[PDB]
Design a protein around this nucleic acid. Structure first.
Ligand SMILES: *C[C@@](*)(O)[C@H](CCCNC(N)=[NH2+])NC(=O)[C@@H]1CCCN1C(=O)[C@H](N)Cc1ccccc1
Ligand SMILES: CC(=O)N[C@@H]1[C@@H](O)[C@H](O)[C@@H](CO)O[C@H]1O
Ligand code: NA
Ligand code: NA
Ligand code: NA
Lengths: 251, 28
DNA sequence: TCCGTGGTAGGGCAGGTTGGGGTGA
DNA sequence: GGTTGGTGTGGTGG
């Protein structure tokens, strides 16, 4: 996260850390949606242009954390993965279209002050909140500049951007399965996600019921926090049926 | 889906984090 | 009105965990 | 102590 700030304790209790067992390295973010299911970005797991293809036994997830590195005794929870599901239409070459994955935990996790699931958006929530200008919130332990990392979890709030602006901002082919978010050069304020923040949730607070909903997954970008450039996120409401089916089919 | 979206240390105590208002004020 | 027949990729033209519908271009 | 213990400087920092 570039030009963000330290997170308050319990501020993003659905934040999840995708870790690799060996070598012990932090790969990405993810998010808690049930006591057994975590949602991350597909490219965190599978990215053939770098021969990345992680099995269920390659990885762990760490839930309830605040420190990036330090073991948070009696606070965090480490879980092994039962099964990984990648979106059948995920395009790792062209543009990370449908850059989404779901990971079933081997055993359900106990919620707490620091561990608690985020809601997925319905049609009404999505209609209502997915508008250019509205701000959401991105969290992660990814890098602070683009070429170090944070001591603890970082947060930033950034506005959703009009599609034509997002389209003009990159050379890359953009799908309606993704949105972009970030400040413009003339908005004064700054901020973006960066490498390592992938799979982390872009979230919005519903004025209708006070609940937080996950509208996006950190997918990609070009540099980090460059003027004229915006972070691209997986459009979660568009893929919610897949999310439903898989859960209901394999819970 | 039942308990979802409601942070134990914020919504369940009626406390706001420092900048969630920033988001809510952005809606228009 | 278009948004499947390979593509990220098998087998097949329908649907699956996938071709729906959305600030849709 | 802390977001969390104690034959308390590591097991995970200070
Ligand atoms: C895997 C994630 O950590 C990471 C998120 C980067 C977000 N950056 C900003 N500024 N919000 N994603 C990536 O690094 C992706 C995956 C592989 C390459 N990549 C990029 O962002 C490229 N710079 C752009 C890109 C390349 C190929 C296909 C799509 C996008
Ligand atoms: C998409 C892809 O690359 N999949 C391969 C898969 O065929 C293999 O079974 C798996 C287990 O090692 O490794 C990976
Ligand atoms: Na930017
Ligand atoms: Na197909
Ligand atoms: Na200690």
């Amino acid at each position: 996260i570039v030009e963000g700030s330290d997170a308050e304790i319990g501020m993003s209790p659905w934040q999840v850390m995708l870790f690799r067992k060996s070598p012990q390295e932090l790969l990405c973010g993810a998010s808690l949606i049930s006591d057994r299911w975590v949602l991350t970005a597909a490219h965190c797991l599978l990215y053939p242009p770098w021969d990345k293809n992680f099995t269920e036994n390659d990885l762990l997830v760490r839930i309830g954390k605040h420190s990036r590195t330090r073991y948070e005794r009696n606070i965090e929870k480490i879980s092994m993965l039962e099964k990984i599901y990648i979106h059948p239409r995920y395009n790792w070459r062209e543009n990370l279209d449908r850059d989404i994955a779901l990971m079933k935990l081997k055993k359900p996790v106990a919620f707490s002050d620091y561990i608690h699931p985020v809601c997925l958006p319905d049609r009404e929530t999505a209609a209502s909140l997915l508008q250019a200008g509205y701000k959401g919130r991105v969290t992660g332990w990814g890098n602070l500049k683009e070429t170090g990392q944070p001591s603890v979890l970082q947060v930033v709030n950034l506005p959703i951007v009009e599609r034509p602006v997002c389209k003009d901002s990159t050379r890359i082919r953009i799908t309606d399965n993704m949105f972009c978010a970030g400040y413009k050069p003339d908005e004064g304020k700054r901020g973006d996600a960066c490498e390592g923040d992938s799979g982390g949730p872009f979230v919005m607070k519903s004025p209708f019921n006070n609940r937080w909903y996950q509208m996006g997954i950190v997918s990609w970008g070009e540099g980090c926090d460059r003027d004229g450039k915006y972070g691209f996120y997986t459009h979660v409401f568009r893929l919610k049926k897949w999310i439903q089916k898989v859960i209901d089919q394999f819970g | 889906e039942a308990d979802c979206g409601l942070r134990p240390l914020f919504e369940k105590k009626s406390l706001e984090d420092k900048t969630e208002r920033e988001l809510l004020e952005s809606y228009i």
